[PDB]
């Protein structure tokens, strides 16, 4: 069960909510089985990571069981001190055990685990996956109205206790405006009992709240459209909420069936409170009082929201019997298009102790004083539409509505005098690809009014804040490019300091205050203290960074935080402003729309500053389709237009913003009949009024008509035809593609019939026979014959059906199918044109042509069916007379407010007959605005486009033959097609000429209209497919550099595209002539050229094509390059057999090359070729260089080759270089031992002594892993690391993570012009020689320190286990029981094959023979990196040359066999010489120069060698050494747990044997059994005397060593001994510990209890053997000791005087002195020493022998004796 298993560990972080702290960059980072990986930092306190992690682990299930996952959540940022903001912890084993093995969207909650009781701080996102032996967890779900609860969708372990509760009270009013939802069927009910009724159907409604999964309901109101509650709800909740959002619905109810929504809204909890604090202890300055910025008791405030109206929007007003085409909106997804009334409430906010839910009635006292905050002033609206393009489908009369909350809907409008709504008109075909608005220099203009609150105190801040973070932006990005212009350090400088002094003097403005302004609310108050705080701060923060010094990048991260700053407190929660809404009809029905911010055209007379971005501003306006989420692959308009809004009081503010003139209009009609029936005609014989209507029935002279106040006549009377089609669409254009229709029509019972007339244009409307089309003067048909268009949605015969024509007569939907039920089919003819230019002064008097003809209609009964063309039947002629009003100059253009309520505001009763306006309104009863231009502006224009880059392919072939559409105002051109590419080059200028645009000439060059660019793929059916488009600027930079610009498609990136564009404004301006002529102001006539000033045109590349200025175009250089792909890492272990047939494909400046197949994943990683070539052109410039990309395919059967990763390189730089290079039985083994060489490199003795007399070699001593010292750069240089990812553009929902990563190298290099030139040596001459090399691996365990203790006794009982790959080796009975710094000295020799199982795990546990072995931490070998070192790092090496002993060569090559490697590896010229001196690259060295100051070295080898070993010493190789480094422990990932001593050693196996390992074995003890005999005692000194008074004394041996009490024994004892006789002969055995290779004497017998080991120490080889009397009926009588040396011992004294103190001595005589380690049988006489303190005194002698035989004859030599 317990069998080592393959497992993946998978992670996924999503979002965080709440994080505590300011200004705040958190990163996640997650770590298990002691491996950590990292998410990428983020910032704010609600970041979104969208980032998966996950983790490779090969171990036993019963070891990643309990194994913890660490998710921490930490604050990293460059200038301040990282900090830990919470943390989250849980095991594998809860993890796995539940379904599917995993936790799918779950919060979990974060706290501090080092700070106690600190509260909850934030929660996080996540979703935890372990995947055991080969399993499966694919589910994903998205359910974000249940995912966002806070019930039952998390877990709380941390600071389970940190919760308080809260009541959120709502008070509900009333609601404005309602739409109709029931049904209108009691319209028809109520008429059976003949009751009076009207169309506006009421509803029932009531409201729902909901919060958290908590909901409360209103009452049901019934019969009403605007609804009064006066209600109460109070909902409990957690202030800690998970949640941002609350909702308030409102439900229509139905008795009968299902209730429907009306509007459905959200209020944010967090744009209503300031949780991130009010005040911070930042104490500024020399002086810090409090050391804070401010003091206060909250420092913060609970979500508020004071009493207002909250706009409701979502689907269409309008009331159908049928199903609704769109009800999503109503339900709060996508965007509201339509106004559906406005509800009126407030909350707030208390903490509580207890939770209930009710709802109440409110007091009459609750209703009567909120009526403060509800007032009403009348505001006005202006609004001007100056274009109308990019039309495309357009069938019928298009018209455009402006509105705002309920006003000028025409639907459901009453009556007014002014129309919200522009008039018809018909489109144009620009002769190129798009319709138009012929709209020309009359342009419509709408004037509306309404009532709504004054909230200008609220909206005034708003607009400043915002002006402040647009003028830094732009400062910022100017900035940001100018670094990459190369500009100069001091003008770099300069602009950072700009930023500074424009914030300052933004923020030094002071803001308005709210405490004049009554009418105020508590959410107000809050924000207005909070925006004062942080504004003081950026002030303060400002300067500074002016005054003080830092890096270029830590200026330019202060301002991008300081940018975000300024946006968060722009916000404003209480808007109870409208939108305005404009939208698109065609016929009469919704086609599009568009909404814009009030705030945004809103204008105060506070200041300038005050004002709307866009008050009296042109916009530019692309409209949208409903129910959409995307930009789409058409747009439905492009329109340009001018808004200003404004209170009634501002009115005479509005005369400054004003263009152009502005007009109303009069009109009457002329009636004549036939005289006398004679042909002549006259006003006489007439039965109608002279002057009329055009109904007939109501008489208007001419002279009755008087200018309303205001106002007055702007000419005099003239005739005005009733349509005026005279136009001109030639601007200024040089080709023309013309098209007809030509219609057939069938029964629909019948068959399909041919008409010989009955061709129309796009609108419907009759035309000319296509046959009978003349080309106009000037012009020259290309195109001999009209042909079938077939790039539309036809069928193969260009025909296109429709179904039996509606009772409208007016078409609609067209398809390509053919049914026998359609009666209709159409096909489309086009003809190319081209102009010929000649004399053009022809067509200057048509320029004067606005009308044709008298203008006269005729008819056979009056006021109906009249014809243009006079008939004989005719009883009946009309014509209509027209007149001009203009504002007075005391008045200017506000006087276009003046006509509502005066055009309307007129009634006479001068009868009882009813009426509307006749007779009291002038003309038209809805007359129109207009604002006429007198003369425009001329423009030219050329695009220059150069290429496109990584274009998406349309198909599985990655082909395709893309063409770009380049589209201006009005006017369009083409590009060339380039065949099967997604790269393509056009190189290709076009050139538009004479575009005229309106406005004031400063105004024109500020706001130019933008260009569009589409990119589309041609193919055989027409360029069905659209590739891609993006929107860019015009310049007026006289020579434009290109620059790229980003293509999107579907909300996707898809490639880039290079080009520049040029715009000349022309001097003469062109000159408009207006119908009711005036006297003209021009005063000056400019007599410019035509085109003589004009720059001169490219050269052309083909006839009619030009090509691109050889200025712009890039200069190019030939360059090679290299690729060194050595092969693929962290791929996963996932399929593996299943995916194991990858191939890389390289590409660079489109060139592509392929690389070889791997068959086996299982066996080799490596590539086999790993040589790459290829030759591209590029740029000079590095801005205009390509990328290098790395694609990762998998080669499977049948010819898939989908891709499965990828990466880029944008620093081909980094890898340049110049093509040019070079050519382009022994007793001295007792104590000289490996042991004491690593002492002496510390400089330590002890265990040395004579050990340093060898004169021998030093090796050098790391205090930390080898790979982290920087001599040798981390030992990581053989190639370089590239990381994949899975990220593609086919789908929005993968990860930006890492999925594997690429080894190899780049090398780019320049090539010669000359192809005579032979190619340079390649850059990389090696083979592939990675295969599966078999090596043998050395490990050393010397010792371990510094270990954490794990059981009571502050010890452990540690062993060494080793794995290498899926091998695994330990020895847990061999080991040192109750140690705290552990010694081994042993060596594991392993064979293993690289790079196959290049990971060595070195693991510690502590030995229990009870219980498990806990882990007490563990290290990680890379051995890949030995084998691959470029340094050499796989053996040891020396300074001093040996053939054999402890300095014996090892390794499996010659020292010159590794100088020739070298020597041919860096490619220089090898050493030469081997005698008495060399010379090598001008240098001569000596040998004489190694050798001086040594000790001859007996076993030095041949000297050929040795002059190899010290040139190789030279260079920058790795020396012999040993090293030691840290442990750790998977459940404390930052904590060492000691360090171990080891090194290792790497010997492939392809050469032949190394020579061996050294024994690195510990020191033991041996007891020998040294010996004492005791031969002659003589002339002892005998102190005590016998009853005879005789001299005597106690004769008996007696000696021992210091803690060997147990080893001791006696002599007996002599009698009589009056001459010191005695003579013993005695064998005495002294079994003491002694090391022989250190030659000391240890102590025996432990005194140790604590632990299973032993005691030992060294001491002083100086013998004391202690002798007193033997008293038998007293206490031992003290007489003296005797003392000898063990190192250092004097040689058996002869005579008398060479028996005394000196010869007791250890070194005072040392000359006389023998060591007893060569000294087997030595007896001799030395002296006693008598007692008396510590003086030195003689009592007598002995004559003993001291010998040392057990270093081999414990007891076969000290015996016979």
């Given at each position: 069960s317990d069998k080592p298993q393959d497992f993946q560990i998978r992670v996924q972080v999503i979002e965080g909510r709440?994080?505590?702290?300011?200004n705040i960059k958190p990163v996640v980072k997650v770590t298990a089985a002691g491996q950590t990986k990292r998410t990428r930092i983020h910032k704010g306190n609600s970041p979104l990571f969208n980032e998966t992690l996950f983790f490779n682990l090969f171990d036993s299930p019963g070891e990643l069981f309990d194994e913890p996952i660490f998710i921490t959540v930490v604050d990293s940022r460059s200038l301040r001190t990282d900090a830990l903001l919470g943390e989250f912890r849980m095991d594998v084993g809860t993890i796995y055990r539940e379904p599917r093995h995993a936790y799918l969207r779950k919060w979990l909650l974060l706290s501090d685990?080092?700070?106690?009781?600190?509260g909850a701080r934030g929660y996080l996102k996540t979703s935890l996956c372990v995947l055991g032996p080969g399993d499966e967890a694919p589910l994903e779900r998205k359910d974000p109205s249940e995912d966002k609860?806070?019930?039952?969708s998390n877990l709380l372990?941390?600071?389970?206790?940190a919760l308080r509760g809260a009541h959120f009270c709502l008070k509900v009013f009333r609601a404005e405006d309602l739409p109709q939802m029931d049904d209108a069927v009691m319209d028809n009910v109520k008429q059976i009992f003949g009751f009076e009724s009207n169309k506006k159907n009421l509803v029932d409604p009531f409201v729902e709240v909901s919060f958290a999964g908590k909901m409360l309901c209103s009452k049901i109101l019934e019969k009403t459209a605007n609804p009064q509650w006066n209600q109460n709800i109070t909902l409990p909740a957690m202030?800690?909420?998970?949640?941002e959002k609350m909702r308030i619905r409102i439900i229509d109810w139905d008795r009968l069936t299902h209730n429907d929504i009306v509007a459905t809204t959200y209020l944010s909890?967090?744009?209503?409170?300031?949780?991130?604090?009010?005040?911070?202890?930042?104490?500024?300055?020399?002086?810090k009082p409090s050391k804070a910025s401010d003091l206060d008791d909250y420092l913060g405030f609970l979500p508020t929201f004071g009493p207002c109206y909250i706009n409701l929007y979502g689907s269409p007003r309008e009331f159908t019997g049928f199903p609704d085409?769109?009800?999503?909106?109503n339900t709060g997804k996508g965007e509201g298009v339509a106004y559906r009334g406005r509800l009126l409430l407030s909350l707030e906010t208390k903490l509580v102790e207890h939770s209930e839910q009710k709802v109440e009635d409110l007091p009459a006292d609750d209703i009567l004083r909120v009526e403060k905050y509800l007032r009403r002033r009348k505001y006005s609206l202006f609004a001007a539409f100056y274009s109308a393009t990019?039309?495309?489908?357009?069938?019928d009369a298009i018209q455009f509505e402006v509105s705002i909350g309920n006003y000028g809907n025409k639907f459901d409008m009453t009556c007014?005098?002014?129309?919200s709504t522009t008039q018809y008109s018909r489109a144009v075909f620009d002769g190129c690809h798009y319709y138009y608005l012929p709209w020309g220099n009359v342009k419509p203009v709408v004037v509306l009014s309404s009532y709504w609150e004054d909230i200008s105190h609220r909206i005034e801040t708003q607009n400043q804040l915002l002006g402040i973070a647009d003028r830094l932006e732009a400062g910022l990005e100017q900035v940001h490019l100018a670094l990459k212009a190369q500009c100069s350090t001091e003008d770099v400088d300069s602009l950072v300091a700009q930023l500074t002094d424009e914030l300052i003097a933004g923020c030094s403005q002071p803001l308005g205050d709210?405490?004049?302004?009554?009418?105020?609310?508590h959410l107000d108050q809050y924000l207005y203290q909070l925006r004062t705080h942080h504004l003081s701060q950026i002030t303060e923060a400002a300067l500074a960074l002016k005054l003080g010094h830092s890096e270029l990048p830590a200026a330019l991260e202060q301002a991008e935080d300081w940018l975000l700053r300024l946006r968060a407190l722009a916000?404003?929660?209480?808007?109870?402003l409208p939108d305005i809404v404009i939208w698109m009809l065609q016929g009469d029905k919704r086609v599009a729309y568009q909404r814009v911010p009030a705030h945004q055209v809103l204008f105060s007379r506070?200041?300038?500053?005050?004002?709307?971005?866009?008050?009296?501003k042109l916009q530019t306006i692309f409209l949208k389709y409903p129910m959409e989420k995307v930009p789409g692959a058409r747009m439905p308009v492009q329109i340009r237009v001018k808004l200003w809004f404004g209170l009634s009081?501002?009115?005479?503010?509005?005369?400054?913003?004003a263009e152009g003139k502005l007009s109303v209009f009069a009109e009457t009609y002329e009636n004549e009949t036939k005289l006398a029936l004679v042909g002549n005609w006259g006003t006489?014989?007439?039965?109608?009024?002279k002057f009329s209507d055009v109904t007939g029935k109501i008489k208007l002279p001419k002279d009755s008509f008087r200018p309303s106040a205001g106002w007055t006549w702007a000419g005099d009377w003239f005739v005005c035809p009733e349509k005026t089609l005279l136009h001109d669409?030639?601007?200024?254009?040089?080709s023309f593609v013309e098209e007809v229709f030509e219609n057939q029509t069938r029964l629909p019972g019948g068959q399909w019939i041919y008409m010989s007339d009955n061709y129309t244009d796009v609108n419907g409307e009759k035309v000319l026979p296509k046959d009978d089309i003349e080309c106009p003067l000037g012009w020259k048909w290309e195109d001999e014959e009209w042909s079938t268009d077939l790039?539309?949605?036809?069928d193969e015969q260009g025909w296109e059906y429709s179904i039996t024509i509606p009772p409208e007569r007016k078409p609609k939907h067209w398809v390509p199918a053919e049914k026998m039920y359609y009666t209709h089919r159409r096909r489309r003819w086009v003809r190319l044109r081209r102009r010929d230019l000649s004399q053009?002064?022809?067509?200057?008097?048509?320029?004067?042509?606005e009308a044709e003809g008298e203008g006269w209609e005729y008819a056979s009964?009056?006021?109906?069916?009249?014809?243009?063309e006079y008939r004989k039947t005719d009883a009946f002629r009309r014509r209509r007379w027209r007149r001009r009003m203009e504002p007075l100059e005391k008045t200017?253009?506000?006087?276009?407010?003046?006509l509502e309520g005066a055009l309307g505001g007129v009634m006479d009763d001068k009868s009882e007959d009813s009426m509307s306006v006749s007779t009291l309104s002038?003309?038209?009863?809805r007359p129109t605005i207009s604002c006429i231009f007198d003369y425009g502006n001329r423009y030219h224009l050329r695009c220059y486009m150069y290429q496109a880059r990584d274009l998406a392919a349309m198909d599985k072939d990655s082909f395709s033959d893309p063409y770009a559409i380049v589209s201006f105002l009005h006017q369009s051109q083409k590009t060339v097609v380039v065949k099967?590419?997604?790269?393509?080059?056009?190189?290709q200028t076009l050139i538009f000429y004479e575009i005229e645009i309106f406005g004031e000439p400063a105004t024109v060059a500020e706001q130019p209209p933008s260009i569009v660019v589409e990119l589309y793929d041609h193919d055989t059916?027409?360029?069905?497919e659209f590739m891609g488009r993006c929107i860019c600027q015009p310049s007026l930079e006289r020579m434009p550099r290109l620059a790229w610009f980003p293509l999107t498609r579907g909300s996707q990136p898809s490639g880039e595209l290079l080009a520049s564009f040029e715009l000349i404004q022309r001097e003469k301006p062109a000159i408009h002539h207006i119908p009711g002529f005036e006297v003209q102001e021009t005063s000056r006539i400019l007599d410019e050229?035509?085109?003589?000033?004009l720059p001169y045109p490219p050269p052309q590349r083909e006839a009619n094509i030009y090509m691109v200025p050889q200025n712009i175009k890039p200069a190019l250089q030939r360059t090679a390059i290299e690729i060194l792909a050595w092969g693929l890492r962290?791929?996963?272990?996932?399929?593996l057999a299943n995916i194991s047939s990858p191939s890389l494909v390289v590409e660079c400046g489109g060139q592509t090359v392929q690389s070889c197949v791997i068959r086996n994943l299982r066996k080799?990683?490596?590539?086999?070729?790993?040589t790459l070539f290829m030759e591209v052109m590029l740029p000079?410039?590095?801005?205009?260089c390509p990328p290098i990309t790395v694609k990762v395919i998998?080669?499977?059967?049948?010819?898939r080759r989908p891709v499965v990763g990828q990466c880029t390189i944008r620093?081909?730089?980094?890898?340049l270089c110049d093509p040019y290079s070079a050519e382009s039985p022994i007793q001295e083994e007792e104590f000289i031992d490996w042991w004491s060489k690593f002492f002496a490199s510390i400089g330590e003795r002890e265990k040395c002594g004579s050990y340093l007399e060898k004169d021998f070699d030093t090796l050098k001593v790391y205090?930390?892993?080898?790979?982290?010292?920087?001599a040798f750069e981390?030992?990581?240089?053989f190639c370089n690391t590239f990381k994949l990812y899975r990220g593609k553009?086919?789908?929005?929902?993968?990860?930006?993570?890492?999925i594997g990563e690429f080894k190899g190298l780049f090398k780019i290099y320049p090539l010669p012009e000359d192809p005579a030139i032979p190619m340079p040596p390649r850059q990389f001459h090696q083979?592939?020689?990675?295969?599966p090399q078999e090596c043998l691996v050395r490990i050393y365990i010397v010792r371990a320190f510094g270990l954490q203790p794990k059981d009571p006794n502050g010890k452990c009982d540690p062993y060494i286990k080793i794995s290498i790959g899926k091998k695994s080796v330990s020895d847990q009975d061999n080991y040192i029981p109750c140690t705290l710094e552990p010694v081994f000295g042993k060596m594991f020799e392993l064979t293993c094959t690289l790079p196959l199982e290049k990971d060595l795990k070195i693991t510690l546990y502590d030995y229990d023979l009870l219980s498990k072995d806990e882990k007490i931490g563990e290290t990680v070998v890379d051995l890949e990196n030995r084998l691959l070192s470029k340094f050499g790092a796989r053996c040891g090496l020396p300074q001093t040359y040996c053939v054999?002993?402890?300095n014996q060569w090892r390794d499996q090559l010659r020292p010159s066999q590794l100088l020739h490697l070298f020597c041919q590896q860096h490619r220089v010229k090898a050493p030469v010489y081997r005698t008495d001196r060399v010379m090598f690259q001008d240098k001569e060295y000596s040998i004489e120069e190694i050798e001086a100051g040594r000790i001859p070295n007996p076993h030095l080898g041949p000297v050929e060698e040795r002059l190899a070993l010290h040139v190789l010493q030279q260079q920058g190789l790795v020396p012999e050494h040993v090293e030691s480094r840290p442990l750790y422990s998977p459940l404390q990932?930052?904590?060492?747990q000691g360090k171990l001593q080891m090194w290792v050693d790497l010997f492939p196996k392809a050469l032949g044997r190394p020579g061996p390992p050294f024994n690195i074995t510990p020191r033991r003890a041996r007891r020998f059994f040294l010996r004492c005999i005791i031969w002659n005692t003589r002339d002892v000194i005998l102190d005590d005397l016998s009853l005879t008074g005789e001299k005597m004394s106690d004769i008996y041996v007696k000696g021992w060593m210091i803690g060997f009490e147990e080893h001791k024994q006696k002599t007996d004892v002599h009698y009589?001994?009056?001459?010191?006789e005695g003579n013993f002969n005695w064998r005495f055995i002294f079994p003491f510990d002694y090391l022989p290779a250190e030659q000391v004497c240890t102590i025996a017998?432990?005194?140790?209890?604590?632990?299973?080991d032993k005691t030992e120490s060294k001491i002083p080889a100086r013998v004391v053997f202690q002798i007193w009397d033997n008293d038998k009926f007293s206490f031992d009588d003290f007489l003296g000791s005797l003392q000898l040396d063990l190192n250092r011992m004097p040689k058996p004294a002869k005579t008398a005087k060479k028996?005394?103190?000196?010869?007791?001595?250890?070194?005072?005589?040392?000359?006389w002195f023998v060591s007893l380690?060569?000294?087997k049988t030595v007896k001799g006489w030395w002296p006693c020493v008598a007692e008396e303190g510590e003086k030195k005194i003689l009592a007598g002698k002995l004559e003993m022998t001291l010998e040392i035989v057990?270093?081999?004859?414990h007891e076969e030599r000290p015996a016979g004796q």
């Open positions: 709440q994080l505590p702290g300011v685990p080092d700070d106690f009781s600190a609860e806070d019930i039952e372990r941390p600071t389970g206790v202030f800690p909420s998970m949640c909890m967090s744009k209503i409170s300031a949780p991130g604090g009010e005040i911070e202890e930042e104490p500024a300055g020399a002086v085409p769109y009800t999503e909106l990019m039309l495309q489908d357009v069938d007014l005098p002014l129309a709210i405490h004049e302004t009554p009418s105020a609310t916000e404003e929660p209480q808007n109870s506070r200041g300038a500053n005050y004002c709307g971005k866009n008050c009296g009081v501002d009115e005479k503010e509005f005369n400054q913003f006489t014989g007439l039965t109608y009024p669409m030639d601007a200024g254009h040089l790039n539309r949605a036809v053009m002064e022809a067509l200057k008097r048509h320029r004067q042509a009964l009056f006021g109906w069916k009249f014809h243009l200017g253009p506000a006087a276009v407010f003046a002038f003309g038209v009863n099967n590419t997604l790269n393509p080059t056009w190189d059916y027409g360029a069905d050229s035509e085109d003589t000033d962290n791929m996963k272990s996932y399929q080799n990683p490596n590539f086999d070729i790993c000079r410039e590095e801005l205009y998998d080669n499977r059967q049948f010819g620093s081909l730089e980094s890898f205090d930390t892993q080898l790979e982290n010292v920087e981390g030992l990581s240089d553009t086919q789908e929005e929902t993968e990860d930006p993570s890492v083979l592939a020689a990675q295969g054999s002993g402890p990932p930052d904590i060492e009589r001994s009056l001459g010191g017998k432990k005194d140790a209890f604590w632990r299973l028996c005394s103190l000196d010869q007791l001595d250890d070194a005072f005589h040392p000359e380690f060569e000294q057990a270093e081999s004859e």
